[PDB]
Amino acid sequence: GFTPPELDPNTPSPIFGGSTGGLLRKAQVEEFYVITWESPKEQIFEMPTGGAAIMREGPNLLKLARKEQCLALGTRLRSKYKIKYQFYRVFPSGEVQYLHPKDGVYPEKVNPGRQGVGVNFRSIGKNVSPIEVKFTGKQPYDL
Protein backbone atom coordinates (compact mmCIF):
# COMPACT_ATOMS: atom_id res chain seq x y z
CA GLY A 1 0.00 0.00 0.00
CA PHE A 2 2.50 2.60 -1.22
CA THR A 3 5.54 1.92 0.86
CA PRO A 4 6.69 5.53 1.29
CA PRO A 5 10.11 6.41 -0.10
CA GLU A 6 12.83 6.27 2.52
CA LEU A 7 14.94 9.37 3.00
CA ASP A 8 18.32 8.96 1.32
CA PRO A 9 21.01 11.06 2.98
CA ASN A 10 24.01 11.81 0.76
CA THR A 11 21.46 13.31 -1.63
CA PRO A 12 22.87 16.74 -2.53
CA SER A 13 21.06 19.97 -1.73
CA PRO A 14 20.68 23.14 -3.81
CA ILE A 15 23.53 25.59 -4.26
CA PHE A 16 22.79 28.28 -1.67
CA GLY A 17 24.91 31.08 -0.29
CA GLY A 18 23.49 31.02 3.22
CA SER A 19 20.78 33.06 4.88
CA THR A 20 19.50 34.30 8.21
CA GLY A 21 16.12 32.72 7.46
CA GLY A 22 17.25 29.12 7.95
CA LEU A 23 16.93 26.79 10.90
CA LEU A 24 16.96 27.86 14.55
CA ARG A 25 16.92 26.29 18.01
CA LYS A 26 13.50 24.73 17.40
CA ALA A 27 15.07 22.47 14.78
CA GLN A 28 17.65 21.53 17.41
CA VAL A 29 15.22 20.62 20.17
CA GLU A 30 11.82 19.77 18.66
CA GLU A 31 11.64 19.08 14.91
CA PHE A 32 12.36 20.19 11.36
CA TYR A 33 11.25 19.16 7.87
CA VAL A 34 13.00 17.80 4.78
CA ILE A 35 11.74 17.99 1.19
CA THR A 36 13.08 16.12 -1.83
CA TRP A 37 12.61 16.47 -5.57
CA GLU A 38 14.44 15.36 -8.69
CA SER A 39 15.18 18.25 -11.05
CA PRO A 40 15.31 17.41 -14.79
CA LYS A 41 18.02 20.09 -15.03
CA GLU A 42 20.00 22.57 -12.95
CA GLN A 43 17.89 25.71 -12.53
CA ILE A 44 17.29 28.78 -10.38
CA PHE A 45 14.35 28.86 -7.97
CA GLU A 46 13.26 31.25 -5.25
CA MET A 47 13.92 29.95 -1.75
CA PRO A 48 10.86 29.88 0.54
CA THR A 49 12.93 31.62 3.24
CA GLY A 50 15.40 33.95 1.55
CA GLY A 51 16.69 34.67 -1.94
CA ALA A 52 17.37 32.36 -4.88
CA ALA A 53 19.08 28.97 -5.01
CA ILE A 54 20.11 26.60 -7.79
CA MET A 55 18.62 23.12 -7.84
CA ARG A 56 21.07 20.51 -9.09
CA GLU A 57 20.43 18.10 -11.93
CA GLY A 58 19.60 15.03 -9.92
CA PRO A 59 18.35 14.52 -6.37
CA ASN A 60 17.66 17.65 -4.34
CA LEU A 61 17.07 17.51 -0.59
CA LEU A 62 16.31 20.69 1.34
CA LYS A 63 15.81 21.06 5.10
CA LEU A 64 13.25 23.69 6.24
CA ALA A 65 12.10 24.63 9.80
CA ARG A 66 8.34 24.86 8.95
CA LYS A 67 5.94 22.37 7.24
CA GLU A 68 4.04 25.36 5.72
CA GLN A 69 7.34 26.62 4.16
CA CYS A 70 7.87 23.10 2.69
CA LEU A 71 4.38 22.99 1.15
CA ALA A 72 4.90 26.47 -0.30
CA LEU A 73 8.13 25.39 -1.95
CA GLY A 74 6.41 22.21 -3.10
CA THR A 75 3.56 24.09 -4.75
CA ARG A 76 5.98 26.43 -6.49
CA LEU A 77 8.04 23.46 -7.66
CA ARG A 78 4.98 21.54 -8.78
CA SER A 79 3.17 24.11 -10.91
CA LYS A 80 5.80 26.64 -12.03
CA TYR A 81 8.17 23.81 -12.79
CA LYS A 82 6.75 20.32 -13.31
CA ILE A 83 8.49 18.40 -10.53
CA LYS A 84 7.22 15.75 -8.12
CA TYR A 85 8.25 16.23 -4.50
CA GLN A 86 7.89 14.53 -1.14
CA PHE A 87 8.58 15.82 2.33
CA TYR A 88 9.19 14.29 5.75
CA ARG A 89 9.38 15.44 9.36
CA VAL A 90 12.53 14.73 11.39
CA PHE A 91 12.68 14.72 15.19
CA PRO A 92 15.78 15.20 17.38
CA SER A 93 15.65 11.42 17.90
CA GLY A 94 16.83 10.59 14.45
CA GLU A 95 13.34 9.48 13.43
CA VAL A 96 11.96 10.46 10.04
CA GLN A 97 8.28 10.42 9.16
CA TYR A 98 7.03 10.51 5.59
CA LEU A 99 4.52 13.34 5.38
CA HIS A 100 3.46 14.23 1.86
CA PRO A 101 1.98 13.03 -0.39
CA LYS A 102 0.72 10.70 2.31
CA ASP A 103 -0.64 7.86 0.17
CA GLY A 104 1.29 8.45 -3.04
CA VAL A 105 -1.37 10.53 -4.80
CA TYR A 106 -1.87 14.24 -4.21
CA PRO A 107 -4.79 15.04 -1.89
CA GLU A 108 -6.64 16.98 -4.63
CA LYS A 109 -7.10 13.60 -6.39
CA VAL A 110 -9.52 11.17 -4.76
CA ASN A 111 -8.02 7.81 -3.84
CA PRO A 112 -10.00 4.68 -2.88
CA GLY A 113 -7.84 3.90 0.15
CA ARG A 114 -8.70 6.82 2.43
CA GLN A 115 -11.04 6.92 5.42
CA GLY A 116 -13.20 9.82 6.51
CA VAL A 117 -11.87 11.86 9.42
CA GLY A 118 -13.91 14.64 10.97
CA VAL A 119 -16.96 14.39 8.71
CA ASN A 120 -20.41 15.32 10.02
CA PHE A 121 -23.48 13.90 8.29
CA ARG A 122 -25.68 16.98 8.60
CA SER A 123 -25.65 20.57 7.46
CA ILE A 124 -23.81 23.17 9.52
CA GLY A 125 -27.09 24.67 10.65
CA LYS A 126 -27.98 21.67 12.80
CA ASN A 127 -25.48 22.01 15.62
CA VAL A 128 -26.91 22.06 19.11
CA SER A 129 -27.02 25.20 21.21
CA PRO A 130 -24.12 25.67 23.65
CA ILE A 131 -26.62 25.39 26.51
CA GLU A 132 -27.09 21.76 25.51
CA VAL A 133 -23.42 20.96 26.16
CA LYS A 134 -22.93 23.13 29.24
CA PHE A 135 -20.96 21.49 32.07
CA THR A 136 -19.86 18.62 29.84
CA GLY A 137 -16.40 18.74 28.34
CA LYS A 138 -17.67 18.45 24.78
CA GLN A 139 -17.91 21.26 22.22
CA PRO A 140 -21.10 21.69 20.17
CA TYR A 141 -19.14 21.23 16.94
CA ASP A 142 -17.09 18.23 18.07
CA LEU A 143 -20.39 16.36 18.22
Partner 1 sequence: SHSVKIYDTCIGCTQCVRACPTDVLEMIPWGGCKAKQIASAPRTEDCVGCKRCESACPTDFLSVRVYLWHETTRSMGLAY
Partner 2 sequence: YQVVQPINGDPFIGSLETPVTSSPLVAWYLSNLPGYRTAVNPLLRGIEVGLAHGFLLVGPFVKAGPLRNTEIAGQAGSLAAGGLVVILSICLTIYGISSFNEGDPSTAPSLTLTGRKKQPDQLQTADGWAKFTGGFFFGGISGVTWAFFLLYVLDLPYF
Partner 3 sequence: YGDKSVYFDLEDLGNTTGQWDLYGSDAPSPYNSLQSKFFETFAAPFTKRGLLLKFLILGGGSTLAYFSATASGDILPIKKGPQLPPQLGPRLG
**Residues lying near partner 2 in the complex (CB under 8 A):** 13, 16-24, 62-63, 65
Q: For residues 17 and 113, which CB has a smaller minimum distance to partner 2 in the complex? A: 17
What's the burial of 31, exposed, middle or buried (CB within 10 Å: 0-12/13-18/19+)?
middle
Work out whether 29 is an interface residue with partner 1 (CB under 8 A): no
Residue 67's binding partner among partner 3, partner 1, partner 2, none (Cβ under 5 to 8 angstroms by kind) is partner 1
At its nearest, how many Å lie between partner 1 and the CB of residue 104? Answer: 13
9's contact among partner 2, partner 3, partner 1, none, with CB below 5 to 8 A by partner kind, is: partner 3
Give how far the C-alpha of residue 98 lies from the chain's centroid of Cα atoms, to the nearest Å: 9
Instruction: Look at residues 45, 73, 52, 59 and name the one whose alpha carbon lies nearest to residue 7.
Output: 59
Angle made by CA atoms 91, 12, 47, in degrees to the nearest 5: 75
- DSSP secondary-structure letter at 15? B
If phi > 0 it is left, if psi is from -120 to 50 it is alpha, else beta; for residue 94 that is left
Residues that bind partner 3 (CB under 8 A): 7, 9-13, 23, 27-28, 32, 34, 56, 61, 63, 90, 92-94, 96
**CB 45, min distance to partner 1, A:** 18
In the shown chain, the binding pattern of residues 60 to 99 toward partner 1, with x for contact by CB under 8 A and - for none, equals -----xxxxx-xx--------------------------x
Cα angle 125, 130, 119; round to 5: 45
| Closest residue by Cα to residue 42 from 8, 12, 17, 6 | 12
Q: Which does 11 bind (CB under 5 to 8 A by kind): partner 2, partner 3, partner 1, none?
A: partner 3
